[PDB]
Amino acid sequence: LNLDPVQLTFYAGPNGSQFGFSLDFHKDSHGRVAIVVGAPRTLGPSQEETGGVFLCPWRAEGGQCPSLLFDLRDETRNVGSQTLQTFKARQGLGASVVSWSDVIVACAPWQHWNVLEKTEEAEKTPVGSCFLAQPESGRRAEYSPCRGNTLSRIYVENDFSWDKRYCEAGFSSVVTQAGELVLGAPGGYYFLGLLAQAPVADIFSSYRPGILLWHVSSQSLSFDSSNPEYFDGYWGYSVAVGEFDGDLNTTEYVVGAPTWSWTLGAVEILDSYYQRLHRLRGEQMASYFGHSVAVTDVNGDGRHDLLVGAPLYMESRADRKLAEVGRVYLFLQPRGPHALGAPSLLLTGTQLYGRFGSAIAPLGDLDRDGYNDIAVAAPYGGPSGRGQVLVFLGQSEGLRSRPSQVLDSPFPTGSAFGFSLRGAVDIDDNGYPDLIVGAYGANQVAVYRAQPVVK
């Protein structure tokens, strides 16, 4: 409703670096807000794409940002009669970033890893890896829970059980208030997908450079399965957290599995022990129901509600025809211990191939009316197909079925304007929460400032 579309702020990164693929707000020890941006195709030391992270200070004019430097050198360790190897080439560092406290977490989902023992090997596979940084102290650390030293032969003998060689840990990342990092690894367990969790504090204290294979006792990974419904479901394609059981001591996880059950798609709500509480199934095959998930209380009943994106959902139209436009599903949490019912609201895209529902960002209370609002992205939507972001306001009855505002892309075609969103943070400290919109296609980030309501 009251985001300022006239006077935006632009941050830009290196050409072809996909600067803006992922972003997030970041407060230092003093509460000073800065933007953290991921550029997964930024050139490394050998003029080869390794990815990179940028930490942008708030500035009404924006501009260029300094790099949050990480180690980008491939590592080797000859230990226990084995050879451990990390391969960072085309790893996609910054394919996802999240900030918690004064710590930043940037993940390279396609960082490869291999082990050699004589004439055998584990296989060179994308286990992924996360890089943790504390900008103020200069502290650094890593977390790569899917690394292993089992040889190829073993997996074959065991019928490829608990095979975590393709996890791509960090595909999606979230952090609980308590400070537990939760990584979505859609490739884990031979493409079933898995979740890995570990306390940030413990990740730091247990890490040392050069070791490559170390233990994090407090870590917790989800489980494998023999059920074909889970096969190639990419469990952990997207992740989120919230409160969905009434017990405020426990934190619940929300996992998207966009191709679950033969591309039907689904999203499940679990406890910290990966026990399923609810499961919402897709409405249509290949719609990619679960591509994105958001958690926030939109009707002001104190209970977190769920939002699910299906960016490829095809809408039924005249003469028995279907039009790929995308869709968002709202699920309101019922009072007390009850199952989430049918969707309370179905928001559907308008532009063909617009991919409405590709991203969904909680804005907090944008207009300050007492109900939380959200933003929904259609990266290839708008009459010009350049990208569009639609704001929907909260209300006692959930959400408004029509958008309160529509942000058209300030960039040129192909920018993927809206592929990443982040809100609910007041970056200019004017009392109103703001929105940052990434357009990796254009290697830029647009900042929208919320202003006092005009009407």
Epitope: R77, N78, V79, G80, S81, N149, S206, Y207, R208, G210, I211, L213, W214, H215, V216, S217
Partner: antibody, heavy 119, light 108 residues
Framework: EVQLQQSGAELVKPGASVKLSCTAS????????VHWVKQRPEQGLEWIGR????????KYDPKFQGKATITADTSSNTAYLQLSSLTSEDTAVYYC????????????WGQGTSVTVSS | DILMTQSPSSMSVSLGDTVSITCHAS??????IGWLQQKPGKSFMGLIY???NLVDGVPSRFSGSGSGADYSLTISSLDSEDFADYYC?????????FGGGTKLEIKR
């Protein structure tokens, strides 16, 4: 806290077979590797072998191959070391070990198990 | 098997001293070494792992160093408990192998 409670002192006759145990406290044995080490006054320390209690795979120093047998039961959260055809040279103190962070390290040690082979 | 030549076998020193133990290998082991401590009539305690990294709980007066086939454990300002047996172990290759050991004794 990580603690490895090894079995009590054992006293057996030559030719017999003893089975030492190493129960884990404050953690799940299945977590890391579990090595067994032999110590003697003059001969000093010697690595026997190790086991991954998760999958049950073992590695031995070719010196002990045949004499030593390492196993682990995740149920009782305990790892074992069985020695057969005992002799006087087998008289030694045995330690079960596991790493702290580094997968291949030797950081945490059990209190030890005294073994004496005599008639 | 990799041999671990640890020296000296023993040394008589007083408190507050800064002594250093050394460990040579029959071949390189890329800082894949660990230092152990065994107080008289007691079990073992991990001091260092991967060359230089202190095991949680170990005093900072301890420090591991070196590279290749030669490494050294150093104790700055000896304490009354520091008088004990110390061993080095390599886990660069299987089987793991230990050093001869070094006994710190009180001088007089």
């Amino acid at each position: 806290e990580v603690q490895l409670q090894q079995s009590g002192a054992e006293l057996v006759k030559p030719g017999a077979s003893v089975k030492l145990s190493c129960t884990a406290s404050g953690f799940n044995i299945k977590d890391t590797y579990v090595h067994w080490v032999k110590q003697r006054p003059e001969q000093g320390l010697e690595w026997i072998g190790r086991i991954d209690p998760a999958n049950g795979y073992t590695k031995y120093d070719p010196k002990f191959q045949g004499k030593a047998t390492i196993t682990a039961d995740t149920s009782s959260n305990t790892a074992y070391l069985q020695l057969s055809s005992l002799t006087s040279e087998d008289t030694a103190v045995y330690y079960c070990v596991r790493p702290l962070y580094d997968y291949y390290a030797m950081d945490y040690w059990g209190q030890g198990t005294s073994v004496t082979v005599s008639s | 098997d990799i041999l671990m030549t640890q020296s000296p076998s023993s040394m008589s020193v007083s408190l507050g001293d800064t002594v250093s133990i050394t460990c040579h290998a029959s071949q390189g082991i890329s800082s894949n070494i660990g230092w152990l401590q065994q107080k008289p009539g007691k079990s073992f305690m991990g001091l260092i792992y991967y060359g230089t990294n202190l095991v949680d709980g170990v005093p900072s007066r301890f420090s591991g160093s070196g590279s290749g086939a030669d490494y050294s454990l150093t104790i700055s300002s000896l304490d009354s408990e520091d008088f004990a047996d110390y061993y080095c172990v390599q886990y660069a290759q299987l089987p793991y192998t230990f050093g001869g050991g070094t006994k710190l004794e009180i001088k007089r």
